[PDB]
Paper text:
Dictyostelium myosin-II heavy chain kinase A ([name]) phosphorylates the α-helical coiled-coil tail of myosin-II, causing contractile bipolar filaments of myosin-II to disassemble into inactive monomers. [name] is a member of the atypical α-kinase family of serine/threonine protein kinases. The α-kinase domain is bi-lobed, with the active site located in a large cleft at the junction of the two lobes. The α-kinase N-lobe is similar to the N-lobe of other protein kinases but the C-lobe has a distinctive structure and requires a tightly bound zinc atom for stability.
To gain further insight into the function of Asp663, an A-CAT [name] mutant was crystallized and its structure was solved to a resolution of 2.5 Å. Although A-CAT-[name] was crystallized in the presence of MgATP, AMP was present in the catalytic cleft. Asp766 was not phosphorylated in the A-CAT-[name] structure. A surface representation of A-CAT-[name] shows that the left-hand side of the catalytic cleft is closed whereas the right-hand side is open. The [name] mutation eliminates a hydrogen bond interaction between Asp663 and the Tyr647 residue located at the end of the β7 strand. The absence of the hydrogen bond in A-CAT-[name] causes Tyr647 to move upwards by 1.8 Å. The upwards movement is transmitted to the adjacent β6 strand and P-loop and disrupts the hydrophobic interaction with Leu659, causing the side chains of Leu659 and Leu759 to moves outwards by 3.0 Å. A-CAT-[name] retains the ability to hydrolyze ATP and ADP, showing that Asp663 is not essential for catalytic activity. The [name] and D663S mutants retained between 25 and 50% of wild-type ATPase activity, but exhibited extremely low kinase activity (~1% of wild-type).
Author numbering: 552 to 809
């Protein structure tokens, strides 16, 4: 943690193989104006001023705590943040637009970051089949900007952070059936997660730079979890109407009927 001018934050990393959250702290310097925007959020350039422990900021009460205490690792010595967010790193911070900040609760920040980590595992499962192009999803973290005056409201300011992508950012499909590029690997990764999960999930909203992807969305047949972008059977079926499995689908031996 550098003594340089910045702001403090509580840092949250999710580890799927142990299925627990890792609680940390960091200092960061955010630019005043955003450099890009989506439908719901704005993105800011940020520089890391160091990652440390959370010893100075106790959780206090177990009751009403989210995420719950049983989902929190008691040891935080190992994590991705210490290398990928080390002092000097340039990264990206994302805030919700006001409005609709009204549709962003504390649970949805953690649910969104857990969803990206889940998609990150599917990328590794995809890469084990040795496709022509390997895909990879970026890390993602929840950060509580504790130095910023709470929404009033009375809730602290939350955000998500992730590594910086350098290059042309392109969206390949949406979360409701659009096919926006001629590339085969993004659609085939979608034709892949739906079949290999036995139709329990599909990963769409495949976007990013080259084969580094971020901000995916998951549909599940019951429509539960994975945020408000989970359109259930409708989202799954909408992908099937516009999908043509391709040479990558064929190479992965996916079923041409869905
Ligand atoms: N990791 C990233 N690195 C650089 N630019 C990004 C990144 N994520 C999102 N963006 C930009 O921010 C915009 C908003 O993305 P979204 O997160 O979908 O609202 C995108 O259209 C990109 O131009
Ligand atoms: Zn396919």
């Amino acid at each position: 943690i550098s003594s340089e001018t910045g702001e403090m934050g509580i840092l949250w990393e999710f580890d799927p193989i142990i299925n627990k959250w890792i609680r940390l702290s960091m200092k960061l310097k955010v630019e005043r104006k955003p450099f890009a925007e989506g439908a719901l959020r704005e993105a800011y350039h940020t520089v890391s001023l160091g990652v440390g422990t959370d010893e100075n900021y106790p959780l206090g009460t177990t009751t009403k705590l989210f995420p719950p205490i049983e989902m929190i690792s008691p040891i935080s010595k190992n994590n991705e943040a210490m290398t990928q967010l080390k002092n000097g790193t340039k990264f990206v911070l994302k805030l919700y637009k006001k409005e609709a900040e009204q549709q962003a609760s504390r649970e949805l920040y953690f649910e969104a970051v857990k969803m990206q980590m889940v998609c990150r595992d599917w990328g590794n499962k995809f890469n084990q089949k040795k496709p022509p192009k390997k895909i990879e999803f970026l890390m993602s973290w929840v950060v509580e900007l504790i130095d910023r005056s709470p929404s009033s409201n009375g809730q602290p300011i939350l955000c998500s952070i992730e590594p910086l992508l350098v290059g042309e950012f392109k969206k390949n499909n949406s979360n409701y059936g659009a096919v926006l590029t001629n590339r085969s690997t993004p659609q085939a990764f979608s034709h892949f997660t739906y079949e290999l999960s036995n139709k329990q999930m599909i990963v769409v909203d495949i976007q990013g730079v080259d084969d580094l992807y971020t901000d995916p969305q998951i549909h599940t047949p019951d429509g539960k979890g994975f945020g408000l972008g989970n359109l259930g059977k409708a989202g799954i079926n909408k992908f099937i109407t516009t999908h043509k499995c391709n040479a990558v689908c064929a190479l992965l031996d996916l079923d041409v009927k869905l």
